[PDB]
Amino acid sequence: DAPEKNYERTMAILQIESEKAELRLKELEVRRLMRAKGDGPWFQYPTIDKALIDHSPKATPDN
């Protein structure tokens, strides 16, 4: 292989791996903040569906 080929192939490898390492650190920080705050699409533990509530008039008024 030419020194140009090895050199530029090395630069492409280094770009891909630096992007992956920065993305791994960002993945760690995103998971930390989403577990802390719960305002993202991850760690959305379920609550009760409010469509299960009967909103009809009941037998007694005070409810």
């Binding site: 891909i16 992007e19 992956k20 993305l23 791994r24 993945e27 305002d39 993202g40 699409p41 959305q44 008039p57 008024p61 005070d62 409810n63």
Partner: protein
């Protein structure tokens, strides 16, 4: 928290319908016939406000219209009504079915002297509409502001940037 507000004892004084349950049960069909409007304004206010403190005055109208219901019995047909609720009052389950001739005497004297038609089978269980002037409660549960929902997903789905990014797996 706060102090729960309660009305005074003068706000709760009304002339009570001081008659027995067999007396109420004897005249109950003509009561539901003739005392329709204030009773239904009260029960509409009672299921809508969900608060009896906001339903006192309408309730007083109930206790205003019930007494005038019984005075109008007492002025005209006291004896057939008395003969009827006594027979209702004998039964331990208070059967209407044991008391049909006294019911017929009371209904005859009421239709003659007051023009009242007894409700049929299926009438007093109707859902009727009520025209009141009081406004609709905009928050009957006194609920505070609901929390804002989480942001939904938008944007077109792109591939994963250089795959799994799991240690050395390039896909």
């Amino acid at each position: 928290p706060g102090i729960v507000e309660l009305p005074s004892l003068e706000d709760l004084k009304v002339q009570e319908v001081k008659v027995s349950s067999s007396v109420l049960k004897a005249a109950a069909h003509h009561y539901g016939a003739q005392c329709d409007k204030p009773n239904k304004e009260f029960m509409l206010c009672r299921w809508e406000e969900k608060d009896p403190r906001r339903c006192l005055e309408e309730g007083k109208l109930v206790n205003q219209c019930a007494l005038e219901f019984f005075r109008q019995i007492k002025r005209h047909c006291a004896e057939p009504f008395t003969e009827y609720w006594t027979c209702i009052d004998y039964s331990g389950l208070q059967l209407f079915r044991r008391c049909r001739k006294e019911q017929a005497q009371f209904d005859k004297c009421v239709l003659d002297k007051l023009g009242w038609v007894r409700p049929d089978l299926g009438e007093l269980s109707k859902v009727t509409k009520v025209k009141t002037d009081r406004p609709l409660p905009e928050n009957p549960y006194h609920s505070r502001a609901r929390p804002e929902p989480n942001p939904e997903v938008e944007g077109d789905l792109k591939p994963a940037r250089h795959g799994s990014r799991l240690f050395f797996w390039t896909m």
